PDB file of C-alpha atoms in Angstrom:
ATOM      1  CA  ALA A   1     -12.455 -15.045  55.129  1.00  0.00           C
ATOM      2  CA  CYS A   2     -12.404 -10.941  55.360  1.00  0.00           C
ATOM      3  CA  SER A   3     -13.447 -11.156  59.883  1.00  0.00           C
ATOM      4  CA  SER A   4     -12.327  -7.806  60.534  1.00  0.00           C
ATOM      5  CA  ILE A   5     -15.621  -5.235  61.233  1.00  0.00           C
ATOM      6  CA  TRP A   6     -13.041  -3.073  58.519  1.00  0.00           C
ATOM      7  CA  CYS A   7     -14.850  -5.798  55.518  1.00  0.00           C
ATOM      8  CA  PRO A   8     -18.491  -5.155  53.939  1.00  0.00           C
ATOM      9  CA  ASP A   9     -20.940  -8.052  54.671  1.00  0.00           C
ATOM     10  CA  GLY A  10     -21.043 -10.920  52.142  1.00  0.00           C
TER      11      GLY A  10
ATOM     12  CA  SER B  12     -29.628  -8.061  40.571  1.00  0.00           C
ATOM     13  CA  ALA B  13     -28.789  -6.015  43.520  1.00  0.00           C
ATOM     14  CA  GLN B  14     -27.080  -9.146  45.067  1.00  0.00           C
ATOM     15  CA  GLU B  15     -24.938  -9.923  42.168  1.00  0.00           C
ATOM     16  CA  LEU B  16     -23.704  -5.888  42.530  1.00  0.00           C
ATOM     17  CA  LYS B  17     -23.163  -6.218  46.148  1.00  0.00           C
ATOM     18  CA  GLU B  18     -21.322  -9.657  45.591  1.00  0.00           C
ATOM     19  CA  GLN B  19     -19.060  -7.893  42.805  1.00  0.00           C
ATOM     20  CA  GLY B  20     -18.242  -4.627  44.990  1.00  0.00           C
ATOM     21  CA  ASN B  21     -16.886  -7.306  47.553  1.00  0.00           C
ATOM     22  CA  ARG B  22     -14.315  -8.683  45.042  1.00  0.00           C
ATOM     23  CA  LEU B  23     -13.717  -5.129  43.694  1.00  0.00           C
ATOM     24  CA  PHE B  24     -13.289  -3.974  47.740  1.00  0.00           C
ATOM     25  CA  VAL B  25     -10.685  -7.056  48.404  1.00  0.00           C
ATOM     26  CA  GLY B  26      -9.109  -6.433  45.303  1.00  0.00           C
ATOM     27  CA  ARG B  27      -7.938  -2.628  46.973  1.00  0.00           C
ATOM     28  CA  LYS B  28     -10.800  -1.097  44.279  1.00  0.00           C
ATOM     29  CA  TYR B  29     -12.560   1.402  46.582  1.00  0.00           C
ATOM     30  CA  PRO B  30     -14.389   3.916  44.188  1.00  0.00           C
ATOM     31  CA  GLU B  31     -14.638   0.939  42.036  1.00  0.00           C
ATOM     32  CA  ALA B  32     -16.247  -1.347  44.815  1.00  0.00           C
ATOM     33  CA  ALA B  33     -18.373   2.249  46.095  1.00  0.00           C
ATOM     34  CA  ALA B  34     -20.094   2.529  42.718  1.00  0.00           C
ATOM     35  CA  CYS B  35     -20.877  -1.464  42.161  1.00  0.00           C
ATOM     36  CA  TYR B  36     -23.250  -0.394  45.600  1.00  0.00           C
ATOM     37  CA  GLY B  37     -24.831   2.361  43.853  1.00  0.00           C
ATOM     38  CA  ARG B  38     -25.599   0.406  41.140  1.00  0.00           C
ATOM     39  CA  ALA B  39     -26.915  -2.491  43.930  1.00  0.00           C
ATOM     40  CA  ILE B  40     -28.377   0.352  45.813  1.00  0.00           C
ATOM     41  CA  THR B  41     -30.024   1.608  42.191  1.00  0.00           C
ATOM     42  CA  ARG B  42     -31.575  -2.529  41.883  1.00  0.00           C
ATOM     43  CA  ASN B  43     -32.960  -2.399  45.512  1.00  0.00           C
ATOM     44  CA  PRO B  44     -32.219   0.914  47.059  1.00  0.00           C
ATOM     45  CA  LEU B  45     -34.570   0.110  50.486  1.00  0.00           C
ATOM     46  CA  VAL B  46     -31.442  -2.416  51.953  1.00  0.00           C
ATOM     47  CA  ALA B  47     -28.976  -1.284  54.985  1.00  0.00           C
ATOM     48  CA  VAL B  48     -25.567  -3.494  54.105  1.00  0.00           C
ATOM     49  CA  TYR B  49     -25.128  -1.732  50.601  1.00  0.00           C
ATOM     50  CA  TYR B  50     -25.320   1.526  52.355  1.00  0.00           C
ATOM     51  CA  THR B  51     -23.195  -0.036  54.875  1.00  0.00           C
ATOM     52  CA  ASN B  52     -20.780  -1.232  52.623  1.00  0.00           C
ATOM     53  CA  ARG B  53     -20.312   1.996  50.321  1.00  0.00           C
ATOM     54  CA  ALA B  54     -19.934   4.079  53.886  1.00  0.00           C
ATOM     55  CA  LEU B  55     -16.574   1.652  54.498  1.00  0.00           C
ATOM     56  CA  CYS B  56     -15.820   2.392  50.428  1.00  0.00           C
ATOM     57  CA  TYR B  57     -15.815   6.175  51.650  1.00  0.00           C
ATOM     58  CA  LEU B  58     -13.695   6.122  54.820  1.00  0.00           C
ATOM     59  CA  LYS B  59     -10.935   3.862  52.724  1.00  0.00           C
ATOM     60  CA  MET B  60     -11.293   6.644  50.331  1.00  0.00           C
ATOM     61  CA  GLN B  61     -10.927   9.327  53.351  1.00  0.00           C
ATOM     62  CA  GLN B  62     -14.718  10.784  52.108  1.00  0.00           C
ATOM     63  CA  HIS B  63     -16.340  10.974  55.831  1.00  0.00           C
ATOM     64  CA  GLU B  64     -18.861  12.838  54.984  1.00  0.00           C
ATOM     65  CA  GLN B  65     -20.533  10.584  51.981  1.00  0.00           C
ATOM     66  CA  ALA B  66     -19.514   8.296  55.127  1.00  0.00           C
ATOM     67  CA  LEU B  67     -21.417   9.928  57.422  1.00  0.00           C
ATOM     68  CA  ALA B  68     -24.433   9.983  54.944  1.00  0.00           C
ATOM     69  CA  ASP B  69     -24.383   6.199  54.351  1.00  0.00           C
ATOM     70  CA  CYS B  70     -24.094   5.412  57.747  1.00  0.00           C
ATOM     71  CA  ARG B  71     -27.487   7.700  58.731  1.00  0.00           C
ATOM     72  CA  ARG B  72     -29.553   5.780  55.484  1.00  0.00           C
ATOM     73  CA  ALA B  73     -28.588   2.511  56.537  1.00  0.00           C
ATOM     74  CA  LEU B  74     -29.425   3.238  60.229  1.00  0.00           C
ATOM     75  CA  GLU B  75     -32.989   4.544  59.086  1.00  0.00           C
ATOM     76  CA  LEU B  76     -33.265   1.166  57.401  1.00  0.00           C
ATOM     77  CA  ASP B  77     -31.427  -1.229  59.708  1.00  0.00           C
ATOM     78  CA  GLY B  78     -31.122   0.376  63.399  1.00  0.00           C
ATOM     79  CA  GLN B  79     -29.605  -3.008  64.467  1.00  0.00           C
ATOM     80  CA  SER B  80     -26.426  -2.594  62.174  1.00  0.00           C
ATOM     81  CA  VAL B  81     -23.272  -3.224  63.657  1.00  0.00           C
ATOM     82  CA  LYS B  82     -20.936  -2.029  60.925  1.00  0.00           C
ATOM     83  CA  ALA B  83     -23.499   1.239  60.382  1.00  0.00           C
ATOM     84  CA  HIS B  84     -23.251   2.385  64.432  1.00  0.00           C
ATOM     85  CA  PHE B  85     -18.969   1.274  63.628  1.00  0.00           C
ATOM     86  CA  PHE B  86     -18.814   3.082  60.672  1.00  0.00           C
ATOM     87  CA  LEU B  87     -21.074   5.961  61.930  1.00  0.00           C
ATOM     88  CA  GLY B  88     -18.724   6.348  64.976  1.00  0.00           C
ATOM     89  CA  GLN B  89     -14.992   6.523  62.838  1.00  0.00           C
ATOM     90  CA  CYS B  90     -16.662   9.237  60.771  1.00  0.00           C
ATOM     91  CA  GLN B  91     -17.176  11.098  64.265  1.00  0.00           C
ATOM     92  CA  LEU B  92     -13.588  10.685  65.646  1.00  0.00           C
ATOM     93  CA  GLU B  93     -12.114  11.757  62.019  1.00  0.00           C
ATOM     94  CA  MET B  94     -14.819  14.982  62.852  1.00  0.00           C
ATOM     95  CA  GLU B  95     -13.264  15.465  66.524  1.00  0.00           C
ATOM     96  CA  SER B  96     -16.667  14.448  68.096  1.00  0.00           C
ATOM     97  CA  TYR B  97     -15.353  12.063  70.453  1.00  0.00           C
ATOM     98  CA  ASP B  98     -18.426  11.969  73.120  1.00  0.00           C
ATOM     99  CA  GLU B  99     -20.010  11.029  70.107  1.00  0.00           C
ATOM    100  CA  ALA B 100     -18.142   8.592  68.604  1.00  0.00           C
ATOM    101  CA  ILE B 101     -17.131   6.802  71.947  1.00  0.00           C
ATOM    102  CA  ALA B 102     -21.207   6.311  72.441  1.00  0.00           C
ATOM    103  CA  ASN B 103     -21.551   4.720  68.826  1.00  0.00           C
ATOM    104  CA  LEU B 104     -18.628   2.636  69.253  1.00  0.00           C
ATOM    105  CA  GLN B 105     -19.892   1.039  72.114  1.00  0.00           C
ATOM    106  CA  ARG B 106     -23.499   0.798  70.932  1.00  0.00           C
ATOM    107  CA  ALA B 107     -21.522  -1.149  68.257  1.00  0.00           C
ATOM    108  CA  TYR B 108     -20.237  -3.171  70.535  1.00  0.00           C
ATOM    109  CA  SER B 109     -23.427  -3.895  72.691  1.00  0.00           C
ATOM    110  CA  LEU B 110     -24.756  -5.173  69.433  1.00  0.00           C
ATOM    111  CA  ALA B 111     -22.320  -7.046  68.372  1.00  0.00           C
ATOM    112  CA  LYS B 112     -21.984  -8.812  71.440  1.00  0.00           C
ATOM    113  CA  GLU B 113     -26.288  -9.145  71.064  1.00  0.00           C
ATOM    114  CA  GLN B 114     -25.975 -10.617  67.584  1.00  0.00           C
ATOM    115  CA  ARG B 115     -22.754 -13.193  68.450  1.00  0.00           C
ATOM    116  CA  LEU B 116     -20.831 -11.690  66.028  1.00  0.00           C
ATOM    117  CA  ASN B 117     -16.650 -11.732  66.110  1.00  0.00           C
ATOM    118  CA  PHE B 118     -14.834  -9.306  65.061  1.00  0.00           C
ATOM    119  CA  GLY B 119     -11.927  -9.996  67.217  1.00  0.00           C
ATOM    120  CA  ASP B 120     -10.831  -7.264  69.055  1.00  0.00           C
ATOM    121  CA  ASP B 121     -11.483  -4.595  66.217  1.00  0.00           C
ATOM    122  CA  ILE B 122     -14.226  -2.713  67.846  1.00  0.00           C
ATOM    123  CA  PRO B 123     -12.170  -2.511  72.022  1.00  0.00           C
ATOM    124  CA  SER B 124      -9.398  -1.659  69.865  1.00  0.00           C
ATOM    125  CA  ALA B 125     -11.472   1.276  68.227  1.00  0.00           C
ATOM    126  CA  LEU B 126     -12.641   2.242  71.222  1.00  0.00           C
ATOM    127  CA  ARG B 127      -8.996   2.564  73.220  1.00  0.00           C
ATOM    128  CA  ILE B 128      -7.897   5.054  70.000  1.00  0.00           C
ATOM    129  CA  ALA B 129     -11.125   7.321  70.967  1.00  0.00           C
ATOM    130  CA  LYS B 130     -11.026   7.800  74.082  1.00  0.00           C
ATOM    131  CA  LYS B 131      -7.143   8.153  73.819  1.00  0.00           C
ATOM    132  CA  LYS B 132      -7.502  11.151  71.450  1.00  0.00           C
ATOM    133  CA  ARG B 133     -10.852  12.141  73.640  1.00  0.00           C
ATOM    134  CA  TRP B 134      -7.843  12.427  76.923  1.00  0.00           C
ATOM    135  CA  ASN B 135      -5.048  14.576  74.285  1.00  0.00           C
ATOM    136  CA  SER B 136      -7.848  16.957  73.265  1.00  0.00           C
ATOM    137  CA  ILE B 137      -9.012  17.859  76.822  1.00  0.00           C
ATOM    138  CA  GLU B 138      -5.317  17.616  78.274  1.00  0.00           C
TER     139      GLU B 138
END
């Protein structure tokens, strides 16, 4: 899900 | 298409291919250089590659295109934290927290966790 802030938007 | 390149870059990021992902965000920038998210996504790549100078430049490009970017202020704060500019880093992390609250964005405890790291480092240097 990549919900961390250390993930690119997308 | 810049959106297809952004999505390819996102897949490479998940696969921990950070220079490859940064190159792909660069391709998205070539196609449309007026979109803040591509610079923010590349800045994140630079932080993972420990190239805080290049990450900093991308944060400034993103802030010129989108002054409300939560991630741009957050990644800028991380760059300033690496450069030991604690007061500026805390201010940017605090701004990121404020913008995330306004925009109803939930990153769990990521931003308060980061602010705690910065305040701890600021105290260590003052001691």
